[PDB]
Design a binder for this molecule. Structure first.
Ligand code: ZNH
Length: 153
């Protein structure tokens, strides 16, 4: 459970992400795929994107990063009260896409890397700690939902 102060820091840096959702999504995906290359295999339509310029130029990929960050932003703004927003995401991700909790941690690492890289002055220790706690709560709750649906994380 997060403090109101913690939620404030999460939402303060989230407002900065929202000045450029699409560029943050690109950087996050580029980082994720480079760091943890197994993750690119869940994206069949992005396989031919073999260099960083090719990744940046893909409207497909760009749009997908806005779709993911939009859903994550809406979850964050509910400050933990996110069952209604979380349930459809667990359903597609447990049953259709097959995304293990470990991959959610990898992308959580990429989000934190990119928010440090772009907003170091608004992403010091206590802000990083809050964002980590928020992402941890997201992943705890999505994993409980995965198990309800019969998917083992
Ligand atoms: C933060 C975190 C996150 C978020 C919020 C998200 C969100 C999302 C959204 C909103 C969508 C659309 C709808 C549905 O459900 O389907 C998606 C999809 C999606 N998803 Zn995901 N995700 C994520 C992570 C992820 C990862 C990590 C992966 C891998 C690796 C993924 C993979 C995915 C896919 C594959 C899809 C489909 C796409 C297409 O196909 O178009 N995912 N996703």
């Amino acid at each position: 459970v997060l403090s109101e102060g913690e939620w404030q820091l999460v939402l303060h840096v989230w407002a900065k992400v929202e000045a450029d959702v699409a560029g943050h999504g690109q950087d996050i995906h580029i980082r994720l795929f480079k760091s943890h290359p197994e993750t690119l295999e869940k994206h069949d339509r992005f396989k031919h994107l073999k260099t960083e310029a090719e990744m940046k130029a893909s409207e497909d990929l760009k749009k997908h990063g806005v779709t993911e960050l939009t859903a994550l932003g809406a979850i964050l703004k509910k400050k933990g009260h996110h069952e209604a927003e979380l349930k459809p995401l667990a359903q597609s991700h447990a049953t259709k896409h097959k995304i293990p909790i470990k991959y959610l941690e990898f992308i959580s690492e990429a989000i934190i890397h990119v928010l440090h890289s772009r907003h170091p002055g608004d992403f010091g220790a206590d802000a990083q700690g809050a964002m980590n706690k928020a992402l941890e709560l997201f992943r705890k709750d999505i994993a409980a939902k995965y198990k309800e649906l019969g998917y083992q994380g």
